[PDB]
Design an enzyme around this catalytic site. Sequence first.
Site, mmCIF file in Angstrom:
data_model
loop_
_atom_site.group_PDB
_atom_site.id
_atom_site.type_symbol
_atom_site.label_atom_id
_atom_site.label_comp_id
_atom_site.label_asym_id
_atom_site.label_seq_id
_atom_site.Cartn_x
_atom_site.Cartn_y
_atom_site.Cartn_z
ATOM 1 N N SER A 194 0.833 -1.226 0.000
ATOM 2 C CA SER A 194 0.000 0.000 0.000
ATOM 3 C C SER A 194 0.860 1.265 0.000
ATOM 4 O O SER A 194 0.282 2.332 -0.224
ATOM 5 C CB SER A 194 -0.969 0.023 1.139
ATOM 6 N N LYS A 220 0.394 3.465 -2.947
ATOM 7 C CA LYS A 220 -0.702 4.469 -3.064
ATOM 8 C C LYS A 220 -0.143 5.889 -3.028
ATOM 9 O O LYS A 220 -0.829 6.790 -3.567
ATOM 10 C CB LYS A 220 -1.738 4.315 -1.956
ATOM 11 N N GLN A 230 -10.754 -5.215 -0.292
ATOM 12 C CA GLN A 230 -10.225 -5.815 -1.549
ATOM 13 C C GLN A 230 -11.387 -6.047 -2.513
ATOM 14 O O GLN A 230 -12.550 -6.107 -2.064
ATOM 15 C CB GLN A 230 -9.508 -7.141 -1.288
ATOM 16 N N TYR A 276 -10.950 1.851 4.587
ATOM 17 C CA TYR A 276 -9.715 1.600 3.798
ATOM 18 C C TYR A 276 -10.049 0.592 2.687
ATOM 19 O O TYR A 276 -10.605 -0.475 2.973
ATOM 20 C CB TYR A 276 -8.556 1.142 4.685
ATOM 21 N N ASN A 321 -8.838 -0.964 -1.384
ATOM 22 C CA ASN A 321 -8.028 -1.056 -2.631
ATOM 23 C C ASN A 321 -8.878 -0.675 -3.845
ATOM 24 O O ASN A 321 -8.404 0.093 -4.675
ATOM 25 C CB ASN A 321 -7.359 -2.421 -2.804
ATOM 26 N N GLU A 327 -0.789 9.671 5.331
ATOM 27 C CA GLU A 327 -1.587 9.828 6.575
ATOM 28 C C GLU A 327 -0.698 10.581 7.561
ATOM 29 O O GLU A 327 0.490 10.228 7.647
ATOM 30 C CB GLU A 327 -2.025 8.451 7.080
ATOM 31 N N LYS A 367 3.137 6.056 5.819
ATOM 32 C CA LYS A 367 2.318 5.054 5.128
ATOM 33 C C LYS A 367 2.927 3.681 5.419
ATOM 34 O O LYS A 367 4.147 3.529 5.297
ATOM 35 C CB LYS A 367 2.247 5.348 3.629
ATOM 36 N N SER A 409 1.764 -3.576 2.930
ATOM 37 C CA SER A 409 2.058 -5.017 3.035
ATOM 38 C C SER A 409 1.620 -5.752 1.777
ATOM 39 O O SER A 409 0.694 -5.312 1.100
ATOM 40 C CB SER A 409 1.396 -5.601 4.247
ATOM 41 N N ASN A 443 5.714 -9.984 6.201
ATOM 42 C CA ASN A 443 4.581 -9.131 6.623
ATOM 43 C C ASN A 443 4.464 -9.258 8.139
ATOM 44 O O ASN A 443 3.776 -10.194 8.612
ATOM 45 C CB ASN A 443 3.280 -9.512 5.928
#
Length: 359
Positions: A61, A64, A117, A148, A150, A270, A313, A316, A341
């Site tokens: 992520s 992004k 997702q 949140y 995707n 963020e 940010k 994973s 992760n």
Amino acid sequence: PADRLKALVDAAVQPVMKANDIPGLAVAISLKGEPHYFSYGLASKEDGRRVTPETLFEIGSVSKTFTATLAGYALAQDKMRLDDRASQHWPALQGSRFDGISLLDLATYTAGGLPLQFPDSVQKDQAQIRDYYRQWQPTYAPGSQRLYSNPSIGLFGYLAARSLGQPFERLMEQQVFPALGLEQTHLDVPEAALAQYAQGYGKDDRPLRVGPGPLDAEGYGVKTSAADLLRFVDANLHPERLDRPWAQALDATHRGYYKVGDMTQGLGWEAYDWPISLKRLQAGNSTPMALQPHRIARLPAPQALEGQRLLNKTGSTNGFGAYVAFVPGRDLGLVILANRNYPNAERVKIAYAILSGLE
């Protein structure tokens, strides 16, 4: 002095690598305009390849923030506006609920409950993605709840690319990475650079490199080195050093639209007040923040995300865990890339110990 910095970074990293069984981890720090690199362990356990600052990791992520930069470029060229209806940039969405949803809603996860997702039923196929968005109906009013997603920021990047008249992946490779001076940053790793691509590790050290998925490029597509991601952080710390449209593109990612708890939401980034407790920065990066809807507190005007703030940010994939943070008002930047992760709380623990120690 180099001894002190190594001691500080070693003290933050070594216990977290041991506790989370992280095979390899790359740290890059920007301190008063000087880069510092610290590399730990193995990119690949099987062939004994060591992590270096040139090792490629999946950043998930964190991708992004690049997607937001491409949108910032489309905004700087007046090819789109954040208050545009989503359906303006894709005729296939005309007559859908995206007639009533802004690009800003998509970018900041407030479109009305787009899921975390794409459902498993949506494959990496243009028609399946089109048909998914055409049939989608909001759970709640656009602009009211952050979830949140995707599919949300994925569509934002897809529509930004359509506004520029070129595929997302082409624009990123041909325009964005070159403008930012990034030659070790890839959506599709060249055969010639595959020797640098770290193995990711899951359960039972199962090997994991991210497979294809719908709008994967926009949401989680980037593979980069610690050295390249720090160049991106340095671009974010000093946008004025870039050619003007790219300076404006990066500035567009430093504008806060609303608060959830201690967190101010920008495009990709963020932000938190700095200083703030480690527990508060962990809570802002917690599982509930990622997985549950939150009522937003909208700001009367967008806020400049500069001065006494930490912009961050997490990202994973099944095999990788990344974290990036910078303090605009202190010219401090941090990149932490790992090939497991491991929990966001642990990534923030490393970052906090380093950023505290540099102060």
